[PDB]
Amino acid sequence: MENIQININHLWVIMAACMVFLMQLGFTSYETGFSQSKNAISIALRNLVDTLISSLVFFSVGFGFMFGKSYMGLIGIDLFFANDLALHPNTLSYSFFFFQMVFASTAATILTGAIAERSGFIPNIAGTAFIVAIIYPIFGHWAWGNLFSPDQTGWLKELGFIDFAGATVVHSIGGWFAMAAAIMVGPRIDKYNPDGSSNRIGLHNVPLATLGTFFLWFGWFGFNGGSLLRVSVNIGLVILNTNMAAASAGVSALIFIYATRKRIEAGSLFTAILAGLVAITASSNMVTPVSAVAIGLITGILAIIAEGFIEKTLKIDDPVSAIAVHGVGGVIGTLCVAIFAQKSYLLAENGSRMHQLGIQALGVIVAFSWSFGLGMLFFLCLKKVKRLRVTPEEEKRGLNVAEAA
Amino acid sequence: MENIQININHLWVIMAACMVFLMQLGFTSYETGFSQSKNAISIALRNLVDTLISSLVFFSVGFGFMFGKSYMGLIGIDLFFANDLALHPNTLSYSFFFFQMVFASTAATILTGAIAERSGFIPNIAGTAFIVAIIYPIFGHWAWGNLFSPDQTGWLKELGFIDFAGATVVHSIGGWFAMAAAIMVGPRIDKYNPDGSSNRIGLHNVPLATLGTFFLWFGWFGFNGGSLLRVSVNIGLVILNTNMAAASAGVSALIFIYATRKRIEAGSLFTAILAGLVAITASSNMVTPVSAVAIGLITGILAIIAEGFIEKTLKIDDPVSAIAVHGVGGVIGTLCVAIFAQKSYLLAENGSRMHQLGIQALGVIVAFSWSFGLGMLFFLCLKKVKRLRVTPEEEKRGLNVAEAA
Amino acid sequence: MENIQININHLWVIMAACMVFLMQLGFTSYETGFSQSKNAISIALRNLVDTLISSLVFFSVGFGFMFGKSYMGLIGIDLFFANDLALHPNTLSYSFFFFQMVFASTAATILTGAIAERSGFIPNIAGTAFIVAIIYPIFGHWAWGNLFSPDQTGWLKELGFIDFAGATVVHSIGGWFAMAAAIMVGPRIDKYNPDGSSNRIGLHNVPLATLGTFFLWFGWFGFNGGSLLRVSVNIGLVILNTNMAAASAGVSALIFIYATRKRIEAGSLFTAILAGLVAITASSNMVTPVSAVAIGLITGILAIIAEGFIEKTLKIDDPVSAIAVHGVGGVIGTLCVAIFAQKSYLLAENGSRMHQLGIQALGVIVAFSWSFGLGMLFFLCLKKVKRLRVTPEEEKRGLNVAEAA
Ligand SMILES: CCCCCCCCCCCCO[C@@H]1O[C@H](CO)[C@@H](O[C@H]2O[C@H](CO)[C@@H](O)[C@H](O)[C@H]2O)[C@H](O)[C@H]1O
Ligand SMILES: CCCCCCCCCCCCO[C@@H]1O[C@H](CO)[C@@H](O[C@H]2O[C@H](CO)[C@@H](O)[C@H](O)[C@H]2O)[C@H](O)[C@H]1O
Ligand SMILES: CCCCCCCCCCCCO[C@@H]1O[C@H](CO)[C@@H](O[C@H]2O[C@H](CO)[C@@H](O)[C@H](O)[C@H]2O)[C@H](O)[C@H]1O
Ligand SMILES: [N+]
Ligand SMILES: [N+]
Ligand SMILES: [N+]
Ligand SMILES: [N+]
Ligand SMILES: [N+]
Ligand SMILES: [N+]
């Protein structure tokens, strides 16, 4: 009876998890599409490799730090190596564990596209290990450490922080880590001219980026729907809202991009779609389809503004607009929780939207400070023992080097 | 008890819907594969864009026209913007809504491949909006307007019209709209020679079209299985029949194409596979696996004959054979309902196959007259304010223009 | 109650089956990626065609031979054409049938990559028909003929042979058939030099092989999870173990390949990942996640050693390392059942690991003798009436010939 509902809940969570695994393929296509053709091999391989690393690091330590027994709402201290997962009374056990593993893989893979084309291999693999072992799961404990282990909470959740599926926990966290990495690696050699103007580099396979967007969008259905952690009538609502945020983000982008540039530029249209997906991840279980449309519209435009600001004003070179999609998109969705969520979902102690907005903002700032700041430190310390970039000669020839024999 | 079965039914419908969403990627690959390499960008982008448009138009008006409260079995008059979806006693609510949205996206995206390579952007996006707002959901009301809202029916269904998953409602409707659009746009510039002979243009990425076929076939599992709208033992039957129709269609094609052309031509083999899929969509819940095999065999050959007739006798230039796959394939499947369906499924008032055949034929003719005729009018009226084709220079250079900076 | 659990069990098995269908696309991408660009068309088409053939042959005879009423634990003798499937009391009927069909398609498609680039069409299609009609389903009866039809068993299962999801039944069987075919076709013309050294041929689309690996890995979730044939809490365990075997196989490979070749070679990294997947298929329901990690680590390295042995010592030319992934990987996983499986799962009559190891080894040797030996005979007899290879001129020009008009 209850045992049959538990079985259905396993089925859905594990199916959703598999859909989220398939986002790993999404990111691989998207990033390869956005890349210069001479680097397509390296970027395909980094994306496969990071999935290997993230799985093992999250199995060994990440899950425990994130969801194990809480030390002061700060960090988890058991469930390393999935120790005694099956003894926990939390009904979803391995299904929950795998679901959260593929979340961690999502957070970590954001990196590769932000430092593509000129970073070396070691910064990628070591970056992956670091985000998955430290940055991601400790923030995750703060935000979500109430979810698995009995009778505990993370300090941010205790204050009333809301992030349904990880706009901040996955996407902003990964995006700010990527942003530090992009800064410390530096721009691609021919990105900026001596007058400060920006060149368009890459996007040599628009069809492949398009296929990437579809895979990502499909996967986000599991990302969002699976985050219910159970099957109810609500499942159709969450997925419909996810779809509507993506679609509205795209349409707002088509309009804004035509009006302001007199053509449809593929790069910015994708950015906007994916940013809307990221944004709706914060709130898709607690908003109406019309609010999902509004969140998409607002996120689509703001993400494109951000993408241009990052590129041309901050002069951070982000070949896939990862910082705009995941970092900024997650901030926007996370803040929108306060504006749009059904009032019964608010956790702010006084019950108000104003107060929830301040808690959401606090979560946003803490996520930035933790992930960008530790990421800066991590890449500063790495740079001291291994150069972060490849040589300029390698950069012009292409990272696809070894397959020439 | 019943509440647990309702939960399982949501789970399946929403999973199926997500599989059908992934057909959008299928069509993108298939069409890009069938295209000339110089146009691959435009076709990838049109396919993504139409998904944005179809989602929002169907959310706003299409669903209401199709499934809302019936005015005389002719058109629905509420459930615009999903108004009060949750209050309906129809148990599937949002899940049903999203399922039917991705059906609408399927119907609309058929267009792009039929007018690829020489139509301009506006005819595509405006065509999408028109099919999704008017043609598709009003015919859908006629055929399926009994399905969601309590105690009503569409006039065609009232006469006993059967289409399980949309051989006519999705595929023929979309295919006849595409056929009007292909006619009004006209053929590609170098398609036909001065002696009337046909050139083979495009299909520059057979591997990508192959991947497209697999995605489509996979998605059709959800398209058909999900149309049960509930989980039963019948789910394996529907999917097995879908598979067997595709496989038989392909084998019949391999045989017929070898016998008549002394080589395996990839284009026609794909046409046949997809046409068999389209055909089995009418009846996969009501036939045996052996009848699914017969439907596939018959559809495979007839679709290839049709594809050649359309191309070389009607001189309609259809770069992906959309009219043959979706238009003709849907007619064949829809007629086969009368021939092959289990007698308990027939709705013809007198209970007979002859009479069901006449009702199926009537549905077929009405679908044609409505979708081809309104499509002709729509593109005639559009042409009066915006030329439907690009300039010949643009056509020879390739629609992939803006990505050259 | 029990009827609702039966419905959930259908849902999962059919979903898993659809995921396994999508492996067909996986193999198509993987093999196309590993191929020389001039042959990509032929390999895409062979992979689509084999899915057509395997479906129909397995529907007609394979399923009956494999799962029908047992004649002496040797071969099944009913359920041809799915005759009376619905009357069987085995609760999963069509769902089970389709699940096992896509297993058969997996076994058969292994062939194409092993003889790619220089075999002709007929050896491929006839090979497919033969493996699906004879080799696969008769061995399948021996190993699994207890599973569907009431009160019977296959002789190997009777001795206590264990293969959860088909490390031997699918993968080794298909891999040894492929190995015979590769031998009888002979090596690609420029594979080996006059001094016996090996050239690297192909792998012209590493990104596409990467996408192939992800699809395969995703599909293996269904392959393994679906093999529970029911939904329980165990579903998360099986999928988590599948993931962990792949990830460990990849990491072990990164380490071993760096240490021994001072670079990451993409081909061997993929080989190892897929071999780990194959291996964990034998035991994913009966091992802990840490043992899945050990199985992956061991399989990853041994598969790479094997791949080199096959190529450079046996001088069998296997363009996708199918023999190493599927043949050797399946042997390793099948033997590991005895080493790692939870003791309650062992079937060896005396209850011991030593004894189970001897039964697993016996299954391994019988699978080899049957599939390699009949495959040798089959291709010897075929060669007598149709040459197995294309002409050297065709081989240098590329099998992609007919699409040039
Ligand atoms: C769970 C954790 C275990 C996983 C362990 C996996 C083992 C990994 C094998 C090591 C592979 C090293 O791979 C190698 O790294 C270095 C450092 O970035 C890269 O080097 C690159 O950056 C350096 C620094 O400016 C350049 O000088 C060099 O010319 C350039 O190629 C190599 O291009 C890359 O080939
Ligand atoms: C829910 C609905 C809201 C969605 C609104 C989306 C906003 C859309 C932005 C408008 C984009 C217009 O895009 C533009 O259209 C025109 C008209 O077909 C195309 O124009 C093409 O056809 C014309 C007509 O012969 C040719 O003269 C022209 O040389 C050729 O390029 C452009 O090639 C295309 O770039
Ligand atoms: C359920 C079962 C029913 C399925 C039936 C399907 C019908 C199949 C149509 C037959 C197609 C034959 O396809 C054809 O086969 C032959 C034999 O390998 C190939 O021939 C190849 O090998 C031969 C033998 O050395 C070479 O001489 C030839 O030059 C080379 O091209 C052709 O390249 C291929 O085009
Ligand atoms: N990844
Ligand atoms: N990535
Ligand atoms: N689309
Ligand atoms: N399309
Ligand atoms: N296949
Ligand atoms: N294959």
Numbering used by the authors:
A (entry chain A), B (entry chain A), C (entry chain A): 1 to 405
Sentences from the study reporting this entry:
Ks-Amt5 crystallized in space group P63 and crystals diffracted to a resolution better than 2 Å using synchrotron radiation. The structure was solved and refined to 1.98 Å resolution, but only the transmembrane Amt domain was well defined in the electron density maps. The detailed atomic model covered amino-acid residues 1–405 up to the beginning of the helical connector between the two domains. From here on, the quality of the electron density map deteriorated due to structural disorder of the HK domain, and although various features such as extended helices were discernible, an atomic model could not be built. The transmembrane domain of Ks-Amt5 follows the Amt/Rh fold, aligning to A. fulgidus Amt1 with a root-mean-squared deviation of all-atom positions of 1.2 Å. As expected from primary structure alignments, all known functional motifs are retained, including the selectivity filter (W144, S227), the Phe gate (F103, F223) and the His pair (H171, H326). Here, two ammonium cations are tightly coordinated by a network of residues, namely Q24 and E31 from helix h1, N47, D50 and T51 from h2 and T109 and T112 from h4. The observed binding geometry with five ligands on each cation is distinct from the octahedral symmetry commonly observed for Na+, and the short bond distances of 2.2–2.4 Å are in excellent agreement with calculated and observed coordination distances of water to NH4+, making the assignment unambiguous. Ks-Amt5 thus diverts the substrate cations that have passed the selectivity filter (W144, S227) into high-affinity binding sites, where binding may lead to structural rearrangements that trigger signaling.
